[PDB]
Design an enzyme around this catalytic site. Structure first.
Site, PDB file in Angstrom:
ATOM      1  N   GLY A  60       0.805  -1.202   0.000  1.00 48.58           N
ATOM      2  CA  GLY A  60       0.000   0.000   0.000  1.00 48.58           C
ATOM      3  C   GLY A  60       0.838   1.252   0.000  1.00 48.58           C
ATOM      4  O   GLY A  60       2.043   1.200   0.268  1.00 48.58           O
TER       5      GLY A  60
ATOM      6  N   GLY B 123       1.018   5.292   1.447  1.00 48.83           N
ATOM      7  CA  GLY B 123       0.545   6.244   2.428  1.00 48.83           C
ATOM      8  C   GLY B 123       1.170   7.612   2.201  1.00 48.83           C
ATOM      9  O   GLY B 123       1.941   7.815   1.255  1.00 48.83           O
TER      10      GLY B 123
ATOM     11  N   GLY C 294       5.845   7.869   2.699  1.00 51.24           N
ATOM     12  CA  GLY C 294       6.563   6.679   2.275  1.00 51.24           C
ATOM     13  C   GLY C 294       5.656   5.534   1.846  1.00 51.24           C
ATOM     14  O   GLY C 294       4.425   5.617   1.871  1.00 51.24           O
ATOM     15  N   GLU C 295       6.299   4.434   1.440  1.00 47.60           N
ATOM     16  CA  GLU C 295       5.645   3.198   1.011  1.00 47.60           C
ATOM     17  C   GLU C 295       5.873   2.090   2.039  1.00 47.60           C
ATOM     18  O   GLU C 295       6.775   2.166   2.884  1.00 47.60           O
ATOM     19  CB  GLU C 295       6.172   2.741  -0.363  1.00 47.60           C
ATOM     20  CG  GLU C 295       5.541   3.424  -1.588  1.00 47.60           C
ATOM     21  CD  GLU C 295       6.151   4.790  -1.910  1.00 47.60           C
ATOM     22  OE1 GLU C 295       5.775   5.383  -2.945  1.00 47.60           O
ATOM     23  OE2 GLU C 295       7.010   5.270  -1.136  1.00 47.60           O
ATOM     24  N   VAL C 296       5.051   1.039   1.958  1.00 41.77           N
ATOM     25  CA  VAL C 296       5.277  -0.193   2.713  1.00 41.77           C
ATOM     26  C   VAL C 296       5.160  -1.374   1.758  1.00 41.77           C
ATOM     27  O   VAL C 296       4.202  -1.450   0.979  1.00 41.77           O
ATOM     28  CB  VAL C 296       4.293  -0.358   3.890  1.00 41.77           C
ATOM     29  CG1 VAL C 296       4.597  -1.644   4.652  1.00 41.77           C
ATOM     30  CG2 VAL C 296       4.340   0.851   4.857  1.00 41.77           C
TER      31      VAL C 296
ATOM     32  N   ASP D 124       0.763   8.845  17.640  1.00 42.26           N
ATOM     33  CA  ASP D 124      -0.379   8.653  16.738  1.00 42.26           C
ATOM     34  C   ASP D 124      -0.933   7.232  16.871  1.00 42.26           C
ATOM     35  O   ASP D 124      -0.365   6.274  16.335  1.00 42.26           O
ATOM     36  CB  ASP D 124       0.021   8.979  15.288  1.00 42.26           C
ATOM     37  CG  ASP D 124      -1.126   8.805  14.282  1.00 42.26           C
ATOM     38  OD1 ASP D 124      -2.253   9.325  14.502  1.00 42.26           O
ATOM     39  OD2 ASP D 124      -0.879   8.170  13.236  1.00 42.26           O
TER      40      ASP D 124
HETATM   41  C1  LIG Z   1      -3.758  -1.774   2.697  1.00 40.02           C
HETATM   42  C2  LIG Z   1      -4.255  -1.872   4.144  1.00 40.02           C
HETATM   43  C3  LIG Z   1      -3.115  -2.346   5.047  1.00 40.02           C
HETATM   44  O1  LIG Z   1      -3.204  -3.411   5.638  1.00 40.02           O
HETATM   45  N1  LIG Z   1      -1.939  -1.534   5.201  1.00 40.02           N
HETATM   46  C4  LIG Z   1      -1.812  -0.274   4.514  1.00 40.02           C
HETATM   47  C5  LIG Z   1      -0.513  -0.197   3.735  1.00 40.02           C
HETATM   48  C6  LIG Z   1       0.699  -0.576   4.617  1.00 40.02           C
HETATM   49  C7  LIG Z   1       0.488  -1.913   5.308  1.00 40.02           C
HETATM   50  N2  LIG Z   1       1.527  -2.116   6.238  1.00 40.02           N
HETATM   51  N3  LIG Z   1       2.572  -1.410   6.819  1.00 40.02           N
HETATM   52  C8  LIG Z   1       3.208  -2.229   7.660  1.00 40.02           C
HETATM   53  C9  LIG Z   1       4.428  -1.710   8.457  1.00 40.02           C
HETATM   54  C10 LIG Z   1       5.546  -2.499   8.595  1.00 40.02           C
HETATM   55  C11 LIG Z   1       6.630  -2.037   9.305  1.00 40.02           C
HETATM   56  C12 LIG Z   1       6.592  -0.740   9.898  1.00 40.02           C
HETATM   57  O2  LIG Z   1       7.664  -0.277  10.603  1.00 40.02           O
HETATM   58  C13 LIG Z   1       7.212   0.275  11.821  1.00 40.02           C
HETATM   59  C14 LIG Z   1       7.018   1.641  11.934  1.00 40.02           C
HETATM   60  C15 LIG Z   1       6.579   2.172  13.117  1.00 40.02           C
HETATM   61  C16 LIG Z   1       6.330   1.340  14.198  1.00 40.02           C
HETATM   62  C17 LIG Z   1       6.523  -0.008  14.082  1.00 40.02           C
HETATM   63  C18 LIG Z   1       6.965  -0.543  12.892  1.00 40.02           C
HETATM   64  C19 LIG Z   1       5.476   0.045   9.760  1.00 40.02           C
HETATM   65  C20 LIG Z   1       4.392  -0.418   9.049  1.00 40.02           C
HETATM   66  C21 LIG Z   1       2.567  -3.474   7.618  1.00 40.02           C
HETATM   67  C22 LIG Z   1       2.804  -4.655   8.271  1.00 40.02           C
HETATM   68  N4  LIG Z   1       3.598  -5.381   9.204  1.00 40.02           N
HETATM   69  N5  LIG Z   1       2.010  -5.731   8.038  1.00 40.02           N
HETATM   70  C23 LIG Z   1       0.976  -5.639   7.156  1.00 40.02           C
HETATM   71  N6  LIG Z   1       0.738  -4.470   6.507  1.00 40.02           N
HETATM   72  C24 LIG Z   1       1.538  -3.383   6.739  1.00 40.02           C
HETATM   73  C25 LIG Z   1      -0.852  -1.959   6.045  1.00 40.02           C
END
Ligand SMILES: C=CC(=O)N1CCC[C@@H](n2nc(-c3ccc(Oc4ccccc4)cc3)c3c(N)ncnc32)C1
Length: 258
Positions: free
Chosen positions: A14, A16, A19-21, A125
């Site tokens: 996805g 946001g 940045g990207e994930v 947040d």
């Molecule tokens: C489209 C809807 C949906 O589900 N989304 C929307 C698109 C992105 C998707 N997303 N992102 C993570 C993730 C992975 C690592 C991370 O590092 C941290 C940053 C701050 C604090 C802790 C860790 C941050 C976020 C992520 C993840 N593990 N697992 C699944 N989806 C993830 C979820």
């Protein structure tokens, strides 16, 4: 904890605002989710002093960070199957999620925030998009350490006078409780980000969601109290949700939505 950028991303989960994930692999076999951070406000230095995100912030309901690159970053964490809680509520699983499931997921979130509280940390947040859902209803808090926007989740103390504290996240926990009990719908339905600040200062609080017991709406209003230090502990919130169907709503009968 810094590996170099030669482990590549497979599936983009996805996009946001910051940045990207992505979904990829690490050391050839570990399945891993990688959050990229575009050249926004990359604190290549003040970001690596973020050694606490990863140190002793290892909890059951916190997303376990694996590694970081020191350009544009790739925060390396575990892969959560069902994605964000916000999508999990909006999606097909919402049709069969009832209150016992929603209150369990709220108890897990309170648990991880109770750990952040015990460690005297702040998660500026907290909402349903920054909470990840695995399988068997495992919720984990993510996106805790970003300092460097969701006004409908931020406490009034922190939106107007920059006073972010752990009690500020209690406020958004209460707003997050509405997302669970409305299956992902957007708080203060019908209002705008500045129409909300006038009403919250004037005393307006969100009413009781449909089919939701006022026992759980009162817990939101404890989290929405004007005075920060009179909002409940996350220790209290965790215990309150853990005992909810025995000490508070033993007469609860499963309805058609909650
Ligand atoms: C489209 C809807 C949906 O589900 N989304 C929307 C698109 C992105 C998707 N997303 N992102 C993570 C993730 C992975 C690592 C991370 O590092 C941290 C940053 C701050 C604090 C802790 C860790 C941050 C976020 C992520 C993840 N593990 N697992 C699944 N989806 C993830 C979820």
């Amino acid at each position: 904890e810094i590996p170099r950028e030669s482990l590549r991303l497979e599936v983009k989960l996805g996009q946001g605002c910051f940045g990207e994930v992505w979904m990829g692999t690490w050391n050839g076999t570990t399945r891993v989710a990688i959050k990229t951070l575009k050249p926004g406000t990359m604190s290549p230095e003040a970001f690596l002093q973020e050694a606490q995100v990863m140190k002793k912030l290892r909890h059951e309901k916190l997303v376990q960070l694996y590694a970081v690159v020191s350009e544009p970053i790739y925060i390396v964490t575990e892969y959560m199957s069902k994605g964000s809680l916000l999508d999990f509520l909006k999606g097909e699983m919402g049709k069969y999620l009832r209150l016992p499931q929603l209150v369990d997921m709220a108890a897990q979130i309170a648990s991880g925030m109770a750990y952040v509280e015990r460690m005297n940390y702040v998660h500026r947040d907290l909402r349903a998009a920054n909470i990840l859902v695995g399988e068997n209803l495992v919720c984990k808090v993510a996106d805790f350490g970003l300092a460097r926007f969701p006004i409908k989740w931020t406490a009034p103390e922190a939106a107007l006078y920059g006073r972010f504290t752990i009690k500020s996240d209690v406020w958004s926990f209460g707003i997050l409780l509405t997302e669970l009990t409305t299956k992902g719908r957007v708080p203060y339905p019908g209002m705008v980000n500045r129409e909300v600040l006038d009403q919250v200062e004037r005393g307006y609080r969100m009413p009781c969601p449909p089919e939701c017991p006022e026992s759980l709406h009162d817990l939101m209003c404890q989290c929405w109290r004007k005075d920060p230090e009179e909002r409940p502990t996350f220790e209290y919130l965790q215990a309150f949700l853990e005992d909810y169907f025995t000490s508070t709503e033993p007469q609860y009968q499963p309805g058609e939505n909650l």
